[PDB]
Design an enzyme around this catalytic site. Structure first.
Site, short mmCIF file in Angstrom:
data_model
loop_
_atom_site.label_atom_id
_atom_site.label_comp_id
_atom_site.label_asym_id
_atom_site.label_seq_id
_atom_site.Cartn_x
_atom_site.Cartn_y
_atom_site.Cartn_z
N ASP A 197 -0.13 -7.53 1.79
CA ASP A 197 0.38 -6.15 1.80
C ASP A 197 1.91 -6.11 1.91
O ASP A 197 2.47 -5.82 2.98
CB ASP A 197 -0.30 -5.34 2.91
CG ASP A 197 -0.05 -3.84 2.79
OD1 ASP A 197 0.46 -3.39 1.74
OD2 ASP A 197 -0.38 -3.11 3.78
N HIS A 234 0.80 -1.19 0.00
CA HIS A 234 0.00 0.00 0.00
C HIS A 234 0.86 1.28 0.00
O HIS A 234 0.32 2.36 -0.18
CB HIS A 234 -1.07 -0.01 1.10
CG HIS A 234 -0.62 0.46 2.44
ND1 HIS A 234 -0.33 -0.39 3.49
CD2 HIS A 234 -0.52 1.71 2.92
CE1 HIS A 234 -0.06 0.33 4.56
NE2 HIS A 234 -0.17 1.61 4.24
N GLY A 286 2.17 6.75 8.70
CA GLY A 286 3.55 7.11 8.45
C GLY A 286 4.56 6.05 8.85
O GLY A 286 5.72 6.12 8.44
N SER A 336 3.76 2.85 8.14
CA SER A 336 3.45 1.79 7.18
C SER A 336 4.65 1.39 6.38
O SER A 336 5.44 2.24 5.96
CB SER A 336 2.37 2.23 6.23
OG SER A 336 1.12 2.32 6.90
N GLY A 337 4.77 0.08 6.18
CA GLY A 337 5.87 -0.47 5.42
C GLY A 337 7.08 -0.79 6.25
O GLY A 337 7.97 -1.52 5.78
#
Ligand SMILES: [Ca+2]
Length: 223
Positions: free
Chosen positions: A84, A40, A175, A177-178
């Protein structure tokens, strides 16, 4: 990260910032030329920033390397966030040292109850917004799949796990994420989603990296 602590400069040497003029997501360095992040977080024009602590000040350990290619998981579903995960290749290999280092992929899946380290530059507030500039850290346990499914009925797949605290107050956030979830020195999760941040009975949901090791290895071997 809400309810965490300041990591300390370069204490999380595999943590990267994905930058497109600004920080927008975390990621994890898994070898000198490849980063794992969340699907995402995909966009074009990514610059990978390694060796960061304060993302707004050049402090002396940074490596900024543009991405040459991104590969979103073949079965990523942006509606459900199933699968994801994405891989990002660097145009040139990073220089590895104490402060910039890869994190190992798991040999086996983690279990509920295991403590992990979650990190990022995301929002530090559950209500409202404050972005921290230096890297934040949170120690949190993986939660049972039954607790996870009870928190998020109809939404948790076999490619997800929950981690954090049902009482609230401590979580990843926008922020982050990942970014990484590291347990016993292996990358077990990717910051993926959750309802708000640090809310009661709404823990963080993370991509279950151990399910993707074959895909990661095969993809790297041919790209
Ligand atoms: Ca910096």
């Amino acid at each position: 990260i809400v309810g965490g602590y300041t990591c300390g400069a370069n204490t999380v040497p595999y943590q990267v910032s994905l930058n497109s003029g600004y920080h927008f997501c975390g990621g994890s360095l898994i070898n000198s030329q490849w980063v794992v992040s969340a699907a995402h977080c995909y966009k074009s024009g990514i610059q990978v920033r390694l060796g960061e602590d304060n993302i707004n000040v050049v402090e002396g350990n940074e490596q900024f390397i543009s991405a040459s290619k991104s590969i979103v998981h073949p079965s990523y579903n942006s509606n459900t966030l199933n699968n994801d995960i994405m891989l990002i290749k660097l145009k040139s290999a990073a220089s590895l040292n104490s402060r910039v280092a890869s994190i190992s992929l798991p040999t086996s899946c983690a279990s509920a109850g295991t403590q992990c380290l979650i990190s990022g530059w995301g929002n530090t507030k559950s209500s409202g917004t404050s972005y921290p500039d230096v890297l934040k850290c949170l120690k949190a346990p993986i939660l049972s799949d039954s607790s996870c499914k009870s928190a998020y009925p109809g939404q948790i797949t076999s490619n997800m796990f929950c981690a954090g605290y049902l009482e609230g107050g401590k979580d990843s956030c926008q922020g982050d994420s990942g970014g990484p979830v590291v347990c016993s020195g292996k990358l077990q999760g990717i910051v993926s989603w959750g309802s708000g941040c640090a809310q009661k009975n709404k823990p963080g949901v993370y991509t279950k990296v151990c399910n993707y090791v074959s895909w990661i290895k095969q993809t790297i071997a041919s790209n």
